[PDB]
Amino acid sequence: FNGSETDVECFLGRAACVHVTEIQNKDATGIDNHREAKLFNDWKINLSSLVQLRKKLELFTYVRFDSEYTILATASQPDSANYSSNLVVQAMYVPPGAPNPKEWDDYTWQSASNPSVFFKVGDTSRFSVPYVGLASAYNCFYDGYSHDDAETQYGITVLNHMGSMAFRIVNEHDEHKTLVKIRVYHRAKHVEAWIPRAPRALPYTSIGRTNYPKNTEPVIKKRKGDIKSY
Amino acid sequence: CGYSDRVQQITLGNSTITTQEAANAVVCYAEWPEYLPDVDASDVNKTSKPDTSVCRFYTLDSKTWTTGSKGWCWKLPDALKDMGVFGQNMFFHSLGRSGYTVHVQCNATKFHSGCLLVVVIPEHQLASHEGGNVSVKYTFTHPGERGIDLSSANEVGGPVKDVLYNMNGTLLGNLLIFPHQFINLRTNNTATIVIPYINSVPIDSMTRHNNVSLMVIPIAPLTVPTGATPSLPITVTIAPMCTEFSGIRSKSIVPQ
Amino acid sequence: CGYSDRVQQITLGNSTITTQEAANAVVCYAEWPEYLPDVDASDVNKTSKPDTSVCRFYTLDSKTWTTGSKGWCWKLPDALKDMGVFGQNMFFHSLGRSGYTVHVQCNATKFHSGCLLVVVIPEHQLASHEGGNVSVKYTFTHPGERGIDLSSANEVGGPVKDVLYNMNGTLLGNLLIFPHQFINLRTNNTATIVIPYINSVPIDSMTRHNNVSLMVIPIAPLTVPTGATPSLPITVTIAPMCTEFSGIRSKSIVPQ
Amino acid sequence: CGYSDRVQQITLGNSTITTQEAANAVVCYAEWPEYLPDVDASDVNKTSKPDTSVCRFYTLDSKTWTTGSKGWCWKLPDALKDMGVFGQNMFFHSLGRSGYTVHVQCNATKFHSGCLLVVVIPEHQLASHEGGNVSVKYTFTHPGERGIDLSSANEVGGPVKDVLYNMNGTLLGNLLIFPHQFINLRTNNTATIVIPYINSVPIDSMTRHNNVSLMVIPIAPLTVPTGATPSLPITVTIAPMCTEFSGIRSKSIVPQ
């Protein structure tokens, strides 16, 4: 049938929870909790977290996306009571090949041409980031380092980077506690896949490196008795 | 007259192989090894055409399929590094387009029982012997002409030698959606795979990037009749067809 | 291309045999197995047509041609008694018309030397082990799927096991005016005999009457090369072709 | 259908040989064995035509190619002296014209490794065992049906038995500008040489003059698989074709 059920576009185009995070806004410095998960967060997007622990995309070799990040932010601190008074959240898609913020009140939240959105807490925002790929397809499964020269990092192959999401709060006034949970749902459009690949045996042990984990249990099942079935 | 198998002269440059038993051909996909990545740039062309002098059948060293053997794995564009005019074009330039034609032949008598699986795996990333958040540092990956040599040659620091996971985490009988052909000693003694060029970037360095791993692995063990030698040879020949390079009128000398 | 022997799918009902080496065919006489005993009775027909569902290739048990072996003999319409829909049509009705097609196959390697004689003998009356004015009481005649089994299985009260007189008083090399074909391990490994229906009465009970004895007998002894097994298997398959029965809209149940 | 080698009935007189494996034919030169030495003498002819009754395939004794064997040599018009109607025409007349057709066959199984060289040498003068200013007195030259039998049968007074000098002073691998064909047990088992008549005088006595020596010699030694017989047979048959004699209505009786 020519029905979009078992084709590739329906196959990968569902929206899945990636990158649960939890931020707040307190003060300039205030109480010494600034850097780890508070006042801002950068993700450095990678579908390597929870696309069923990298399976359906790893079934193919070469893909091309057109992503739709739908950021669902919510107020973990009782929104029913308060902790939501115009709590405007700022998202930001920092493209690959651009500097990353590492502070809440930092210059690259307001800089030039960095796509940033603002929405109410407890509401959503829909994106459409086009195919930001260095290669003509996303090399999800690549053999080779970056150079025999200086060589950027290692065969993680972050050269075909997709982007980097940044989330922060524009608010003030340390007298109180708030907490905001942000949950982004990636969805891929117009997915064009190439070069089918045999599936993995184990759940993985690394991102980027196609390593199979040590100390394994048997992935295949013993016969219930002998070759004699039933 | 009688049997008329395609065993005539495939002579090509310095290479005059023409050793074909049951000369049936399986190509990787519907795409043949094709030269042109585009038409033109609306300009006069001095395009690097080495197909007149790269299309030789560069054979390899022969490898001895014993009963206690597990498999062999060569990284295909980097197996031919220290050899041929193709290797000197590989170091001499940087970037090149290379479609390959791989002809694996196994000498076997009528009396030998066994089966082989040849398989061409595009962009075969490797699994480490460490098996953690580290892999081989690409010294142990592609020795060239010697292969990874999975048959009971275990080592430390580089790739794993586990044959069921085929350095990939995948599964052995599940590997056949890659291009493949079975060498059945009842039926045939050789196998041919026609490999077109495959990369998301149309032109690429083969010194840096390992396009293809080639694996020949025994699925069924070889049972020779007793009183014979418990070893059979595997010979693999590569004919890089419709091969292109980039560094036209540019490259002077780089020694390594 | 090359050798193109008739080894294609002879699939027929539940049977998909298609094992033919040198697929030459010898029919019994000039008459093929033919359905119609007449045209009509100038009347509308509900004639029993089971050829849609009787024409399966009902194989037998395999029998091991050793060096010390003499022969095997099955009574053909009564060999298939406890088996198939044909056997249940045989007890279920009484009278039936059954032409047969017998395909005897012997697995043999290139190295085995010997010859067999298959022979189809119409109305083969038996000679007793008593050899007087008494024969077998038709309990020891047709065991079904097991045969008389002439190879050194001597018994008392029933038929003789003498192979030169072939339970007939006749002579071994004189037996060939019956339909026959020689299985020569130099040349072939199988034999086919096409048996049309044969009886002086056009329709007859096969529970009572033994139409055909089938004999496979080794004329030349089997000499295997030493170090191999001194045994070769014989497989015989029966495809009852153009088979007809009489008891239309009549038979309810008879158990036995 | 399939392989269709020319193995059909070459029946000829009392001879019905038709044993041809890979029945390719090499003739000595461009000239076929042809009857007529001229047209006529402008006169009515009673020309001796024995081709109706001389063209039989007169075979020889078989000779056993062992591993320790060197070669065999028959003098061709005088090998057939004590035999056939051709021999009685040879003593019965004096002069005759005889073209020959020599078919050397070697029985060999698939498992035997070796090569033979047949060679037809016109006017093969002999080298003596004395090796001086004397040769054989033509008693030890042509025993007939037995040959010189070079294989380790050394003697005194007659020809040498040295196989490299082939009783000629010539050299073994240099011998092939004479008509020849190699019997390679991988490829063939027999050889045919078609010998037209050759002499500077158009008609000549074959009792006096030895036209042709026929040599069959093993270039490569025969390696049988162990456990088999270390001997293979050589059978040579001569069919004198387009054979003519001179003594028409002249010869009464000469006994010897």
Curated annotation (Swiss-Prot), chain A:
Localization: Virion; Host cytoplasm
Function summary: Forms an icosahedral capsid of pseudo T=3 symmetry with capsid proteins VP2 and VP3. The capsid is 300 Angstroms in diameter, composed of 60 copies of each capsid protein and enclosing the viral positive strand RNA genome. Capsid protein VP1 mainly forms the vertices of the capsid. Capsid protein VP1 interacts with host ICAM1 to provide virion attachment to target host cells. This attachment induces virion internalization. Tyrosine kinases are probably involved in the entry process. After binding to its receptor, the capsid undergoes conformational changes.
Quaternary structure and partners: Interacts with capsid protein VP0, and capsid protein VP3 to form heterotrimeric protomers. Five protomers subsequently associate to form pentamers which serve as building blocks for the capsid. Interacts with capsid protein VP2, capsid protein VP3 and capsid protein VP4 following cleavage of capsid protein VP0. Interacts with host ICAM1.
Protein name: Capsid protein VP1
Taxonomic source organism: Human rhinovirus 14
Lineage start: Viruses, Riboviria, Orthornavirae, Pisuviricota, Pisoniviricetes
Residues included from the entire protein: 627 to 856 of 2179
